[PDB]
């Protein structure tokens, strides 16, 4: 947990800077190590602190990241499995002619930004007034 | 006389663009990785379309990627049989509209990213700028006319009606490679790129050397 994030920060960091399908799944695939639950935390976190710095433009693709992450970790634990096992199969069903699984994920996408929107005004409104 | 019209690339393209011409990166060959991937793209998008209305297999049944260099006139072509864009595609997408993607490559850049993850953010077209000086691209979409999209970096880009020969349908990408990066233009460059970065294209790709 804490000793992960003290160990791949620099990884994790350079893994929200994504978006493509296919690439970030060889990014995935080889490191594995990856697909963890720490990962989207970081993400999260990062996203919020980027919101803070205006770097909106930032936060939207890092979000495409950290719903990645989310719908894996969902996806293999769903299926009982481990997600180090179950992590390329998010990106079969993305190309899969059913476009409501990945509504599904831009749903949660927008919805995502938008909460974290929230919690970086009511971070800046503890200490504003 | 012919219509074209010049019009000016977005704030963050034209910064993007200025960088990624100066700045000397080291894995160069990424554009064509691009490239290839963005055709693959132009090929699934198609067949979606021609799976609910067959009539527009009547520009070409093939599908597949061709790559043709040529040492002697100092270009790549790259063509690719699916569907193209429109001149609205063209003028809109490559230029005019805005990607949040090329905003946050660039700060990305300032957090500690890579060169390999430029078509990431969907900023996967203009890096062929690292190797070329002049990009040129034309396209014959099924609902449209023949266009030709040209643009010599700086800032600005030209759109006109293209005379040249019916393509049917497809891209069709001539790169006006650089005077010194003319490495691309070789077969065995060409071919270990491709077996290196595009192997996971599901559509047959074939160079053409002279």
Known sequence: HKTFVE????????????????????????????????????????????????????????????????????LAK?????????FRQFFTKI?????????????????????????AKLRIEKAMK | ??????????????????????????????????????????????????????????????????????????????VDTGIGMTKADLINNLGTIAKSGTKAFMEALQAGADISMIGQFGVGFYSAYLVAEKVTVITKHNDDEQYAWESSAGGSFTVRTDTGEPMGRGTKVILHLKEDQTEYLEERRIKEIVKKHSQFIGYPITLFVE
């Open chain 1, 7 to 74: 160990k791949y920060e620099k990884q994790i960091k350079h893994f929200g800077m994504l978006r493509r399908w296919d690439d970030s799944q060889k990014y995935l695939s080889d490191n594995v190590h990856l697909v963890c639950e720490e990962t989207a935390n970081y993400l999260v976190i990062w996203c919020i602190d980027l919101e803070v710095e205006e770097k909106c433009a930032l936060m939207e693709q890092v979000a495409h990241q950290t719903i990645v992450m989310q719908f894996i970790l969902e």
């Open chain 1, 78 to 86: 769903s299926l009982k499995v481990d997600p180090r096992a179950c």
């Open chain 1, 95 to 119: 190309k899969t002619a059913d476009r409501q699984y990945m509504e599904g994920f831009n749903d949660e996408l927008e919805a995502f930004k938008e909460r974290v929107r929230g919690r």
């Open chain 2, 1 to 78: 006389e012919e219509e074209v019209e010049t019009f000016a690339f977005q704030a963050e393209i034209a910064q993007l663009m200025s960088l990624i011409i100066n700045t000397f990166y080291s894995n160069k060959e990424i554009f064509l990785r691009e490239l290839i991937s963005n055709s693959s793209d132009a090929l699934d998008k198609i067949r979606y379309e021609t799976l609910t209305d067959p009539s527009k297999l009547d520009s070409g049944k093939e599908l597949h990627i061709n790559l043709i260099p040529n040492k002697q006139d100092r270009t790549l072509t790259i």
